[PDB]
Amino acid sequence: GAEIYNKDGNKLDLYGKIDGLHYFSDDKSVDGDQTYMRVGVKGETQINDQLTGYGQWEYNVQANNTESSSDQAWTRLAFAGLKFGDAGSFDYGRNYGVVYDVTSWTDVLPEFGGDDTYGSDNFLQSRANGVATYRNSDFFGLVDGLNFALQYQGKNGSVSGEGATNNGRGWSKQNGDGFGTSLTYDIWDGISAGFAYSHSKRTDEQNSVPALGRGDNAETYTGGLKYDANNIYLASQYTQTYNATRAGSLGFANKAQNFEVVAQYQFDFGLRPSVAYLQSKGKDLERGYGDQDILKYVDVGATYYFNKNMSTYVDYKINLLDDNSFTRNAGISTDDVVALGLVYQF
């Protein structure tokens, strides 16, 4: 970030990046120019000796389509909050679900990883609307690395009808009232463990419009491990979900088990190779689908950091999914992808 303002107890940072990015793939919905930029503002005000006020907004602006194209920009984050010394912080708005406090440990690939085809707004697993989040860092300032979070999310319902809210959306991004919690900590120097749990009510449209997934509650359980020392980064996460993992355009998996593992090495001159394996296995799917792989790929790439403001990267998604009636009907890509990027960050 770049501090652009600091007067009379208020500071503002401007941050973002411009990513000149191209994908090469046989999947025509992914192949081609993917250039985009992100811009954001982070503010913080000293209210009193212990109390601070803050705000953050992060905007994504696509630059890979024409000036006559639609829906090219969107808000990723927008929240306001208060932090009281070591007692913790509280913020509300569009923010990350606390499941990401642990699953973010494997979200370190040069380009790929993280969100799936539909994106965020997947209960408390990624960026979400209307989350109230309490966080406590370093256990009231006493235990370095021991962090916890408690989160609540209000219902974001249908566009119209009895299940509507003002900010309605399609079944794949709807949610009822929900809660989540996360706890991360260091076992040893450079070694961390983390746990996250979430439970949300599902909506009537989620239980009637798509063909797959039925249940009143969406739940996730995650465990994660991280090694970050001696220029080596190792991370793994395992998540078991119930009615919460999308099965592409078909609905939700009644049960799913997601596993991700990554190994990276940082050379002092800037080069950072990366190798990872990601899989999401769906269980008990309806319509005779039974058990199906939803995601399965090995990732190999590298980022070269010129400095903190400039980098270049390559990433190879080695797609291990077979083409079958599930991947075709769900619209899940089975093709490999190569990404090439040049990034200026502020």
Next chain:
Amino acid sequence: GAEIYNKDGNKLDLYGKIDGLHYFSDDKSVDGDQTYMRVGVKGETQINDQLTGYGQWEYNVQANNTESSSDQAWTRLAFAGLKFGDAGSFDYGRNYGVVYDVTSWTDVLPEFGGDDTYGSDNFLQSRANGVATYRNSDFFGLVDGLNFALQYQGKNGSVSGEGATNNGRGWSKQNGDGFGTSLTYDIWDGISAGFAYSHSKRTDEQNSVPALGRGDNAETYTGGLKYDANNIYLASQYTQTYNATRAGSLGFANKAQNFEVVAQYQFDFGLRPSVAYLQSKGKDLERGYGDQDILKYVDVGATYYFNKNMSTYVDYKINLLDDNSFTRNAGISTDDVVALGLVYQF
């Protein structure tokens, strides 16, 4: 605002807010997450000892819907102008209609009020496209507190056809050529009186597409009073309109009588309780409607200012409208609403 640049006669103020907001209501089109942010710039250049140039842009970015939702950001203001000593200022672009010079005195509620009796792009009552505005403060420097404005707005017509302009829109936001004037007198520190007038040609689509309201011209007459001293804020405004006030989706009221009154108290410790009453009465409505209430509510709330950069509020709109064929057919909300907000300001 936050001044981020001030060099070689030019200065730029970056301003905005991030409002973590939630509405509680039985009306499902209102209920839920309402988080949004505003961001703008105010620029000013000293051309010479007597001449200053200026520009302002204000953007609204909703953050309560998904990253794949449409139409989540829009420009509220965008205008450039010149100010010449005591001779006044002139600006053109998207800016407030001069009726708001007086009705803004009651637009001070913690959350509600504002675009209720006179919504956006509603002739010269609120923000408007293509307004050319001449303003004069302290009557050419000769009468302290005496301000006046003269404004002209060119036609903003239909999307296609004989009534079109490049920037066409639907009947509810159209206008023909029009003008407005306002005069406000700050007679003494904290005591003010104001008058505003507007007259616009109506369009052919406004006299055909909506179910209600017919006439060649839209006219408004406003009177206002404001007391702001001794930690107390009192204000009232009365506006009588002809073919200018919207009757929801039904069209325009042939005549309307709009009234707003507010009383607030500012405690030194930061709390600002507020009580208000707002009403808009439609008269001589066609199709058997006769006289109907378009808007009617008591507002009770409070804002707590932590400092100049952070605040929190609660607002309770006690909706006095009843569900009837007019409110149903016009799409006017008759339910109560509670708003809870946490705002970071810059």
Next chain:
Amino acid sequence: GAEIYNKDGNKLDLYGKIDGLHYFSDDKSVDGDQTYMRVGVKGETQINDQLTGYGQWEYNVQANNTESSSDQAWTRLAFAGLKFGDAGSFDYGRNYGVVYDVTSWTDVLPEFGGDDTYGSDNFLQSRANGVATYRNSDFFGLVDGLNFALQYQGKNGSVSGEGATNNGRGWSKQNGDGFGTSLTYDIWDGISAGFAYSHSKRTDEQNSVPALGRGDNAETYTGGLKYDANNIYLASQYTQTYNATRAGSLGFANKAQNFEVVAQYQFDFGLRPSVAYLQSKGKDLERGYGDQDILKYVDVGATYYFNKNMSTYVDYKINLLDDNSFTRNAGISTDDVVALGLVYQF
């Protein structure tokens, strides 16, 4: 540009403008309020004493329509690059096609000139998606004033089908693989000559959907001249195209000859009168059209610069086109336009 950050080798410049603009014309698709603003950022990081990293984003935000109107903002530019001593620079993203390195010399009118009705995304003639651009200044430092560029653009295909890419668009803005080069030389102080060439594959939809133009490839050849000294600015460019110039909504011209010439004078007190002639003539058009003028007008205007941050202008497009079957079927405006603008710049 306004430098809002300069610390540790990283520099950020915020730039843009707010243009309070109104057009007066008998053409209802152009007549009326045209207010808009531009905002951008130019960032540069010193990686080492010879290598620099950079990025630029330019955003256009229309402010002439309502807050409920769609598609009012878009990215004009977004690219990241590396610049290394005399070896040159390389950038990738949304950037100008290298034909603009020479045609930009006539794109200096108060308001008119530049892009036509469809706008940019016209092979390498204007702003384009997915362009990889190599530039070299002063021929590796060996020939002062001799610059060149080499550019590649990957396919930007259809929305769906065999010829699709992720960022698909309509035939008017598609392209296959393309290459461009430019070369400019300052013969003497203030006198330059330039040449540019582009060759792009045309897509199957371009060769099947539109009424006019058929060919495997789009090709352009440009020569230009500029005099910029003694407060005088004269420039001209001639471009010959094959299957590259849009014939309005009808398609592309099998052959076209474009010519633009401009003359301006800068008075020390701020006034800058301007006169220009612009023509685009389609040759070998199918369906009995034969030779037709696609664009033909004289431009007379003036800009008054109060200083570097504030200006006002009047521009008069004297449209020499006649209403015929070609202009009617192609949707080409044949009407005169007068533009009046008041601009604040940062």
